[PDB]
Design a protein around this ligand. Structure first.
Ligand SMILES: [Mg+2]
Lengths: 122, 86, 118, 132, 86, 108, 192, 101
């Protein structure tokens, strides 16, 4: 349990919101449970949101040589789940964020995280 | 007016775009140097897998016997049965 | 008044060391080096040693192939550069008779080559 | 007629696995995907080279575990941890198995430059979902 | 024996087992002694805690694993340890 | 020298023990560097000699002032703003771009 | 083969210990006869010992609620607390004025170069500036496309230098020299 | 060891466009700018038209990363229609469904 309390005052992270893009809603909401209970026993305030799915549909030909009238159509289901953390500490950041980041799913997982750190003007 | 023109000049000097009034046919210069050319992009020059490390390592590993490719087995065998007669 | 606290600084391993402290050893499982398939579990100590030395064989066997052909693995893709993953060069690159070539052959531990060129 | 990934009906003696049996219209309605890489989502760059490496892995492991891969592989890709989970049969010797595991374990690490891990899963006989 | 098994369990001192042959000798002797003077319930508890997770029993131990059961007259455990040995 | 580094090697051998867990696989993988640094900063390594914001976009220190009222100096404003709005090139390739034009502009 | 560890395993045996890390299924390890796959007409969903469908499922076996709770006993070491900066947004605005957007885009595979991860945008309030009278007019006319009127927020964006920290430097430098040029009275302010 | 000669012909095109990109870039801007004299460009013209005709980014044909087919390529995966159909229909390309809207 090496801790190493070092020197300078905190970076004061406001609204570290994680936008989770995926191909599978069942992985996304299992992830929601894993992060919601982790934030519950972490003490950090979490909220849930569902940024709406985008389908990238596109058309190709079906036959190799001719018959342009007979076509195939393929689609991508991109779904988003927003997990916005508000009022969290800089030390609180690279331990929760880190736990989740390492314990990310596979190809159905992105973790786009925006950070609004506060500060004083100069 | 003149104040709007030179206020845009002050803002340009501040933020870092071109200061004096220029036209679009020359502003294409700063847009150029601001982006990469068609050939310098990562995807453009890395379009094809070089195919040599790939296929030649397959050659060497098959000749070391750690890789069995059924396709080369076919051509090996067919070329033998063709060299028997051709 | 803001009690703005100082950030305690961690290394890159301490979280995962605390995670091992979370997962104490499984009293019912074989060591993680072996696979979990019931056909591939070693049954005896001799069989386990045989499997481990076969795995170590496969390791210096890939090292031999990769060091014999470094040209097929020169393309780095990971950022940052991982010099423990780039191939090792064992052939002396300095062919002229020089003390730099002596240092190169000593570093490559080529005893006979170092003696001959000395 | 559509002939894409449809094993046609023989005479009722053709062993076939869940994967081969399902046709492309069941591609995530009943089957799912055999390779889990993130590049085909909305915003990402490198999906093309992920697929170029994907077909490579399928054919390398096909030619390197010669005639023992029961059904096709699961090339998942989380972090820099590429994984080649397998369903390999129970015919070759375990020392040979551990050897080709190690050989691959290190060779794809030095080809793709990241952690590559093979978690074999030995099976007695090639499975049959239905006889077509 | 329990004292230095405790010294082993202090922190990372388990690392100072080192190689597999030393590990097998260490745990073989520990289990011999557990069978020779411990009570049969804690011997079977150490059996399930150590085998096969810590080490693979050597041929001799098998015989000894039994002598303790014969002394304790717990011959009902014979089929399961036989199955484990097989 | 070779004796102290060889003592380091042998100390590593006498403290090399089996991995015994999937977490310790990641321990060794970070320890070597094949595993990524987590959490990631999308800019690990990638220092650019401490460019720090004034070499990249204020090219006046490399401008090498000619008479400023000339069309050439206008060009240098235009090309300077282009290299300022370049984020893909670093300061060193910006200054070799400048010297290309400097060399050639003189060449004429 | 071998009789599996599944029926060797009993109840009250620690599952965080059984699965430490994220790993694909391994049904021999798994003590659950979980069945997957559209069944046959007069049959059941396919068994557990050989399925590829049970392999291709992400597999959140490694992280069970109790594993979360015990995981963070240790993960609790590494956190301070926030001050009484209050949930009140006006209170944290008074206490710490500016706001900055500085994000990462984590991918998955060989590299971590996503260039668009250098986007840095800065939002500041003039009611938190407090030292702006007629010098405000200056700031507005200077920043043309920013300052939406309904909320009094200035948003300056930098994506001009490759690194995120010097982008943060460009936000703060442009803020302070915009501030100093706004408080710089110039000779043509009267002939408006 | 390239799928065909035409693919190998572009791999050559790609290479020497990528190496010969800076020189062309410099003289070309100099072309479409309005600052230098009408005659001060005629010279730069020579350099460009004289810079070799296998690096001009007008000859780059985004062909197939697996099987040289010029027309019928989808850029996002660098694959032709029928090869992308084969992989997405065998189910080794994640996320690609069959469009049923
Ligand atoms: Mg039809």
């Amino acid at each position: 349990p090496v801790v190493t309390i070092s020197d300078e005052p905190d970076i004061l992270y406001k609204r570290l919101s994680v936008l989770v893009k995926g191909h599978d809603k069942a992985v996304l909401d299992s992830y929601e449970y894993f992060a919601v209970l982790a934030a519950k026993e972490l003490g950090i305030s979490i909220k849930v949101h569902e940024p709406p799915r985008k389908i990238e549909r596109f058309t190709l030909l079906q036959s190799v040589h001719i018959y342009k009238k007979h076509r195939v159509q393929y689609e991508m289901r991109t779904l988003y789940r927003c997990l916005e953390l508000e009022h969290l500490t800089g030390s609180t950041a690279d331990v929760y964020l880190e736990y989740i980041q390492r314990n990310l799913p596979e190809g159905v997982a992105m973790e786009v995280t925006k950070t609004q750190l506060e500060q004083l003007p100069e | 007016s003149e104040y709007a023109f030179r206020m845009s000049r002050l803002s340009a000097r501040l933020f870092g775009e071109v200061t004096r009034p220029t036209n679009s046919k020359s502003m294409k210069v700063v847009k150029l140097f601001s982006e990469l050319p068609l050939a310098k992009k990562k995807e453009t020059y890395d379009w094809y897998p070089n195919h040599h490390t790939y296929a030649e390592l397959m050659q060497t590993l098959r000749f070391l016997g750690l890789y069995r490719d059924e396709h080369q087995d076919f051509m090996d065998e067919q070329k033998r049965l063709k060299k028997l007669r051709g | 008044e803001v009690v703005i606290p100082k950030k305690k600084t961690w290394d890159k391993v301490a979280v995962l060391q605390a995670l091992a402290s979370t997962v104490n050893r499984d009293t019912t499982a074989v060591p993680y080096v072996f696979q979990d398939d019931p056909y591939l579990m070693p049954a005896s100590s001799l069989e386990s040693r045989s499997f481990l030395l076969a795995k170590k064989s496969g390791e210096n066997v890939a090292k031999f192939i990769i060091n014999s052909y470094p040209k097929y693995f020169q393309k780095d893709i990971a950022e940052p550069h991982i010099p423990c993953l780039m191939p090792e060069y064992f052939e002396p690159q300095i062919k002229d008779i020089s003390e730099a070539a002596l240092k190169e052959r000593i570093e490559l531990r080529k005893v006979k080559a170092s003696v001959d060129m000395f | 007629k559509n002939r894409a990934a449809r094993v046609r009906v023989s005479k009722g003696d053709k062993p076939v696995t869940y994967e081969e049996a399902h046709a492309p219209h069941y591609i995530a309605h009943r089957k799912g995907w055999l390779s889990l890489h993130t590049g085909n989502l909305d915003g990402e760059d490198h999906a093309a080279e992920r697929t170029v490496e994907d077909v490579f892995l399928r054919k390398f492991m096909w030619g390197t575990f010669p005639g023992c891969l029961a059904d096709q592989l699961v090339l998942k890709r989380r972090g820099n941890q590429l994984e080649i989970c397998a369903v390999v049969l129970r015919q070759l010797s375990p020392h040979k198995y551990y050897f080709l595991v190690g050989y691959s374990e290190t060779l794809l690490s030095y080809f793709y430059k990241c952690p590559v891990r093979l978690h074999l899963q030995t099976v007695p006989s090639k499975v049959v979902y239905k006889y077509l | 024996a329990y004292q230095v098994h405790g010294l082993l369990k202090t922190g990372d001192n388990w690392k100072f087992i080192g190689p597999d042959q030393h590990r097998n000798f260490y745990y073989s002797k520990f289990f011999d002694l557990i069978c020779l003077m411990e009570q049969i319930d804690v011997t079977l508890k150490w059996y399930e805690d150590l085998i096969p997770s810590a080490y693979f029993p050597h041929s001799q131990t098998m015989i000894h694993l039994l002598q303790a059961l014969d002394v304790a007259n717990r011959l009902e455990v014979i089929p399961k340890i036989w199955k484990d040995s097989k | 020298s070779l004796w102290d580094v060889e003592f380091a090697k042998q100390l590593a051998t006498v403290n090399e023990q089996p991995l015994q867990n999937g977490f310790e696989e990641l321990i060794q993988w970070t320890k070597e560097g094949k595993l990524w640094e987590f959490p990631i900063n999308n800019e690990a390594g990638f220092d650019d000699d401490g460019s720090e914001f004034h070499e990249h976009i204020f090219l006046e220190k490399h401008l090498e002032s000619f008479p400023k009222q000339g069309p050439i100096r206008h060009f240098m404003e235009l090309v300077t703003c282009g290299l300022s709005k370049n984020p893909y090139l670093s300061v060193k390739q910006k200054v070799e771009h400048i010297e290309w034009f400097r060399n050639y502009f003189n060449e004429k | 083969a071998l009789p599996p560890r599944t029926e060797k395993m009993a109840v009250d045996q620690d599952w965080p210990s059984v699965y430490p890390v994220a790993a694909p299924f391994k049904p021999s390890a798994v003590p659950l006869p979980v069945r997957m796959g559209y069944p046959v007409k007069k049959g059941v969903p396919m068994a557990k010992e050989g399925n590829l469908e049970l392999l291709k499922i992400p597999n959140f076996l490694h992280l069970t609620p109790v594993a979360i709770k015990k995981h963070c006993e240790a993960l609790k070491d590494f956190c301070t607390e926030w001050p009484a900066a209050l949930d009140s947004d006006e209170k944290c605005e008074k206490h710490f004025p500016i706001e900055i957007d500085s994000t990462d885009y984590v991918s998955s595979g060989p590299s971590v170069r996503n260039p668009r991860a250098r986007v840095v945008v800065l939002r500041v309030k003039l009611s938190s500036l407090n030292l702006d009278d007629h010098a405000k007019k200056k700031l507005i006319k200077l920043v043309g496309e920013r300052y939406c009127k309904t909320t009094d927020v200035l948003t300056i964006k930098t994506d001009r230098c490759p690194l995120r920290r010097q982008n943060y430097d460009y936000a703060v430098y442009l803020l302070t020299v915009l501030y100093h040029e706004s408080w710089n009275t110039e000779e043509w302010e009267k002939s408006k | 060891h390239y799928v065909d000669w035409r693919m190998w012909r572009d791999v050559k095109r790609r290479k020497m466009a990528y190496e010969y990109a800076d020189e062309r870039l410099r003289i070309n801007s100099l072309r479409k700018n309005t600052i230098l004299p009408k005659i001060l460009q005629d010279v730069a013209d020579e350099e460009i038209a004289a810079l070799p005709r296998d690096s001009c980014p007008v000859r780059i044909r985004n062909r197939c990363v697996m099987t040289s087919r010029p027309r019928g390529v989808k850029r996002r995966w660098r694959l032709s229609r029928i090869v992308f159909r084969h992989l997405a229909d065998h189910g080794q390309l994640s996320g690609i469904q069959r469009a049923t809207w």
